[PDB]
Structure 1
Amino acid sequence: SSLQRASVSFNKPGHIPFGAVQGYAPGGVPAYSNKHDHYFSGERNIEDNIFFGFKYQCVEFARRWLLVRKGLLLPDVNWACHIFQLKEVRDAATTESFAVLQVRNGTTTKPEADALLVYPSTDANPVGHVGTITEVGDDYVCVADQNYRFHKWESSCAYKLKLDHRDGIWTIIDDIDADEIEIPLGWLTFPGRANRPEGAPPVALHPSLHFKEPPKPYLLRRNFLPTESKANWLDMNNPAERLFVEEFGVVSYYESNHEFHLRCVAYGTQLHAIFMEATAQVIESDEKLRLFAIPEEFWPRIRHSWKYQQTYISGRFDFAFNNETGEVKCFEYNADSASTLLECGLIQQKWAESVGLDKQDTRGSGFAVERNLKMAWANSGATGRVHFCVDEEREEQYTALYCMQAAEAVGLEGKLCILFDEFRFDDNGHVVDSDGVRVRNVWKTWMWESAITDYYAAREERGENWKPSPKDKVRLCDLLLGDDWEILYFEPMWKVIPSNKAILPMIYHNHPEHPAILKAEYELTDELRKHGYAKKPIVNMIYQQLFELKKQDDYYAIIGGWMIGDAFSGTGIREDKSVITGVDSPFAAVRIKTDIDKMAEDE
């Protein structure tokens, strides 16, 4: 019991883990959990060179289901909804094309089982959706799919939809969520092909239907000569974009193929899982917590943080990438607070528009950022007012205002706080703001170390019998390390752990397979002496292996990879001919070369 405000996590109640079997469609076709809406793993489902789809999206089910159930291969389709515009599929054995029949919703045709129901594209759901209709009642249809609902099925389908019948017309309506009604376009039948017998084994596919090995990934430094350029290209009204300009006063950017971007989504999301696992191990060990130099006095608190709050908004990986070898290696996870968010999720596209580089065939590397900040916030567990707290530093202010825009977009109320005078103590020692409201949610750039130092400093300046009264000005340590441990902090206190170089030998030991992990040890080893090592200490030592930074046009380049909530949501670059300090280094635009040009990340 004990915990007055609810613990929060991104594992929502109802939902089952990514990849757990939710249930089976008739014929023994399993539906896997995609964790939650709009989650994207970056990982392909391939058995025996048959590319089914992405782990686990809605089309992936459609396609898997069609093979097992009818012996027919659904062709490549970028957006679910485009399925309704298919005229033909293909035969698993002969490859001969095979005529689907398109049957529109809201006509005089009743729907029937073993059809692919297809929802349209909307301003509110841009790729649409595809399910299988497994049964058709008098007044409903049953649907089997992936990536719409996340529960353990209580039957052979995911859900039931209304089937309306008035004046001769049949209309499947999805009004389950009464404030997000959708009407499907219609459904594809496959007239002439019987279901495969139930408990028949799967057909083997003609090898000319094997997945074409994708192109090897590349990230390549390009030079462009803009024909059209815009004098003022940022929106000076928007406060975020203003503080940027007053901070920073034939061109260049990087081009990645779609495969490189997929490789980052997959490596990103997996590294995040790996760091989180590691972070649990540290949290449960007195020894490891002393190693990370967390003072013993803060263990109850950090441990509490870890139990109480399993949500978080941002963290940034630092990668190197080598074009010839294909290798992506991760140096570190700056999960407490990273610069570069506004640049990545806005300024670089804005810029690209200014030099006319947003042609049809490429996209802004951080297109997802905006939409995923909203989803982090919407699912963060924060409710009521959120205080965004920063220093007299513009870089932090535009970082903050950018997450406020996202916060305010999803129903949260926001208040930017520069330093600590917006706050006061009330009659009972609690921290409150200028309108008299008790603090409950705090997003901040202020670092936990800075707080821990201010706490130790504070400890004499007033003493140890001291108890806050309205007389006392609020300090950092009161705003982040006061007696109210149930304030949600964004980036929570446990985020110091995965940010700490001491986690690096632990993630190496737990998962040395991972193509992105670098060998790291607590002690020098003969093998590190051969490969080359860096001796990186902490807040004794850790030793990590070296990776070559390869140059293009003489520039070294480090890649930043954002986690926004649990989404890997984009990449940016900083480059330098000498040393990428990224306090003072030029940021570089990353563009992805790809309705024939749209992706799966949008689902």
Structure 2
Amino acid sequence: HHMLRHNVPVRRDLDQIAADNGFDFHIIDNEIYWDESRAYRFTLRQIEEQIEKPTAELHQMCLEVVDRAVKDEEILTQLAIPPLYWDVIAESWRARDPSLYGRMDFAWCGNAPVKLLEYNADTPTSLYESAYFQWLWLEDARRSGIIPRDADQYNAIQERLISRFSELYSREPFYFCCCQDTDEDRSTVLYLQDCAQQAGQESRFIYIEDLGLGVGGVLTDLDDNVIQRAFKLYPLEWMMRDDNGPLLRKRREQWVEPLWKSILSNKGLMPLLWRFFPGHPNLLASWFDGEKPQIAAGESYVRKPIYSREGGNVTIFDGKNNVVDHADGDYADEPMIYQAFQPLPRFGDSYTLIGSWIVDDEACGMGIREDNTLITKDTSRFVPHYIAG
């Protein structure tokens, strides 16, 4: 009936399993990250009616926000998108530059509708864990009897990724890049590279720091080959703030995620979703800093930077304007949005976030994270789930 969590025994060979499968960040700084000492059990109806169908519909609503924003200079201004990039973002949308993936983050409310907290539509991680490692967990768990033998999992992510790379096939090499000094980012990009290569797409990896420029600002690799298409685990808004940002206007190279996705990874998406779909069951009231609050006196509320990751610089306020929770981060100088407050559900002493995956426009799986405060932070743990009943 109700979604629940229960303890399960950790596999006695977890560390070997993680090594054999390339999961080199399952423990981070000698702290547990991958946490299979518990698991969440959903019914198929909860999956289809409360997560999958709402995710697919919310994505369509977001595409309507993109379409409205690129045609309205007041909206682009509210989103704080630099005017230099308005034309090339509008053109990116006009050409329908292809999207690969994105992840929506949800507050679970029991039998009530889930509430969308934000759309990590540019550089989401926890992909390897959601698409791959928790499926191997499911297979082992079914065999060992710690969950029902016929348990399923809301997870078609790898299949949809491979099929998308097939659709996007090109004989020109497909570059993949991330920054140095983060195993998680590299393994996210390596996982996408493996999916691409499974679809027959030749792929090459290059660190962001090793990207070069040829005469006239042409993007090149370390052997001075011209990069014509790249997936980047690097934020679009930093690309546009960089001194070389103006070179994006020429559209000489293809980017994944594409430029128009900068509208969806902007947390200004949340006020716009509320403006254009007021009262939608899966939405929270939201407004830009400086607009009249859309909650009554007394209610708690959340202030978020328009650009941030892992709860960075998020503050939850109570209705007396005291701090309920706060997270450090590198985003303190970004403009801010406000949102009505729906607490994450609490299981034991953990607060649980649902990440719901989109591949192109299709809702196709979810991964769960747990943390010790109301704001999901960098200390969070990934927890497997399964479907039964």
TM norm. shorter chain > 0.5: yes
For residues 554-574 of structure 1, what are the alpha-carbon distances to aligned partners after superposition, in whole Å with 9 as ceiling and x for unaligned?
321111111111111111111
Q: Residue in 1 aligned with 2:282? A: 516
Q: What's the counterpart of residue 197 of structure 2?
A: 408
5 Å-filtered alignment, 1:283-294, equals 283-294=70-81
Distance 1:318 1:243 in 2: 25
2:318 corresponding residue in structure 1: none
Query: Cα 1:531–1:425, aligned 2, differ >3 Å: closer, same or farther?
Result: closer
**Structure 2 residue aligned with 1:332:** 118
Name the residue aligned to 2:39.
Answer: 253
Query: How far 1:549 sits from its partner (Å)?
Result: 2.7
Distance 1:550 1:426 in 2: 51
1:533 matched residue in structure 2: 301
CA RMSD of aligned residues (A): 2.7
- Does 2:9 match 1:222? no
Residue 486 (structure 1) shift: 4.2
1:387 maps to amino acid: Y
The answer (yes or no) to whether the contact 1:524–1:543 under 8 Å persists in 2 is no
Q: Mark the CA change 1:446 to 1:225 in structure 2 (over 3 Å): closer, same or farther.
A: closer
Q: Percent identity?
A: 27
Question: Is the alpha carbon distance of 1:582 and 1:344 closer, same or farther for their aligned partners in structure 2, counting shifts above 3 Å?
Answer: farther
SS at match of 1:339: coil
User: What's the CA shift for 1:251?
Assistant: 2.2
Instruction: Give the paired residue count.
Output: 350
Which residue matches 2:218?
A: 430
* Correspondence 1:373 to 2:161: yes
> CA 1:435–1:412 in structure 2 vs 1: closer, same or farther (change >3 Å)?
farther
Does structure 1 residue 453 correspond to structure 2 residue 234? no
Go from structure 1 to structure 2 and tell me whether the alpha carbon gap of 1:380 and 1:517 turns closer, same or farther (over 3 Å shift): farther
Query: What are structure 1's unaligned runs of at least 5 residues?
Result: 1-215, 459-476, 595-603
Counterpart check, 1:269 vs 2:52: no
Partner of 2:382: 587
| Residues 382, 562 of structure 1: alpha-carbon distance in 2 compared, 3 angstrom cutoff | farther
Normalising to structure 1: TM-score of the pair? 0.54
CA drift at 1:280? 1.1
CA separation in 2, counterparts of 1:429 and 1:495?
Answer: 23
Decide which of 245, 260, 268 is 1:494's aligned counterpart.
260
Distance 2:294 2:274 in 1: 17
CA spacing shift, 1:317–1:382, aligned 2, 3 Å:
farther
Instruction: Specify the SS of the correspondent of 2:338.
Output: strand
Q: What is the aligned partner in structure 2 of residue 384 from structure 1? A: 172
Q: Is this contact kept in 1: 2:301–2:340, CA < 8 A?
A: yes
Cα separation, partners in 2 of 1:527 and 1:581, compared to 1, 3 Å:
closer
Change in CA separation of 1:246 and 1:501 when aligned onto 2, cut-off 3 Å: closer
Q: Is the 8 A contact 1:562 1:569 kept in 2?
A: yes
Q: CA separation in 2, counterparts of 1:533 and 1:434?
A: 48
The Cα offsets for residues 16-75 of structure 1, whole Å up to 9 and x where unpaired, read as xxxxxxxxxxxxxxxxxxxxxxxxxxxxxxxxxxxxxxxxxxxxxxxxxxxxxxxxxxxx
Asked whether the 8 Å contact 2:4–2:40 carries over to 1, the reply is yes
Equivalent-residue separation in structure 1 for 2:361 and 2:225 (angstroms): 30
1:235 and 1:532 mapped to 2: Cα distance?
41
Structure 1 Cα separation of the partners of residues 80 and 302 of structure 2: 20
| Displacement after TM superposition at 1:320 (Å) | 0.7
Distance 2:119 2:165 in 1: 21
Question: Is the contact between residue 575 and residue 588 of structure 1 (CA under 8 Å) also seen in structure 2?
Answer: yes
What are the Cα deviations for residues 531-555 of structure 1, in whole angstroms up to 9, with x where unaligned? Answer: 5433445436533211133322232
Against the structure 1 CA distance between its residues 519 and 255, is the aligned structure 2 distance closer, same or farther, given a 3 Å change threshold? same
Go from structure 1 to structure 2 and tell me whether the alpha carbon gap of 1:552 and 1:424 turns closer, same or farther (over 3 Å shift). closer
Query: CA–CA distance in 2 between the matches of 1:248 and 1:258?
Result: 36
What amino acid sits opposite 1:440 in the alignment? Q
Greater percentage in helix: 2
Number of the residue aligned with 1:303: 90
Tell me how far apart the structure 2 counterparts of residues 442 and 293 of structure 1 sit (CA, whole Å): 25
Between the aligned partners of 1:344 and 1:579, the Cα distance in structure 2 is: 22
Q: Give the counterpart letter for 2:37 in structure 1.
A: V
Structure 2 equivalent of residue 244 of structure 1: 25
TM-score, structure 2 as length reference: 0.81
Partner residue in 2 for 1:342: 128
CA 1:350–1:565: 2 relative to 1, 3 Å:
same
Output the CA distance in 1 between the equivalents of 2:108 and 2:114.
5
- Alignment partner of 2:135: what SS? helix
Secondary structure of the equivalent of 1:234?
Answer: helix
Q: Which is greater in Rg?
A: 1
> SS at the partner of 2:85?
helix
Residue pair 1:311, 1:381 contacting (<8 A) in 2 also:
no
Tell me if structure 2 keeps the 8 A contact 1:335–1:495.
Answer: yes
Pair 1:559–1:429, CA change in 2 (3 A): closer
Q: Is the 8 A contact 2:18 2:24 kept in 1?
A: no
Rate the CA distance shift 1:225–1:243 in 2: closer, same or farther, 3 A.
closer
In structure 2, stretches of 5+ residues that fail to align are 31-35, 307-333
* d(CA) in 2 for partners of 1:547, 1:231: 35
Task: Identify if the C-alpha distance between structure 1 residues 235 and 441 changes in structure 2 by more than 3 Å, giving closer, same or farther.
Answer: same
State the structure with bigger RCO (CA 8 A, min sep 6), 1 or 2: 2
The answer for the alignment partner of 2:323 in structure 1 is none
CA distance in 2, matches of 1:500, 1:326: 27
Do structure 1's residue 398 and structure 2's residue 187 form an aligned pair? Answer: yes
1:439 lines up with 2:227 in the alignment:
yes
Cα–Cα, structure 1 residues 381 and 305, in superposed 2: closer, same or farther, change >3 Å?
farther
Change (3 A) 1:437 1:257: same
The one-letter code matched in structure 2 to 1:485 is R
* Offset, 1:247: 4.9
Question: Who is 1:544 aligned against?
Answer: 339
The one-letter code of the counterpart of 1:411 is G
* Structure 1 residue 500, shift from structure 2 partner: 1.6
Report if the CA contact (8 A) 1:560-1:572 is conserved.
yes
Contact kept in structure 2, 1:572 and 1:589, CA below 8 Å: yes
CA distance in structure 1 between the aligned counterparts of 2:89 and 2:385, rounded to whole angstroms: 37
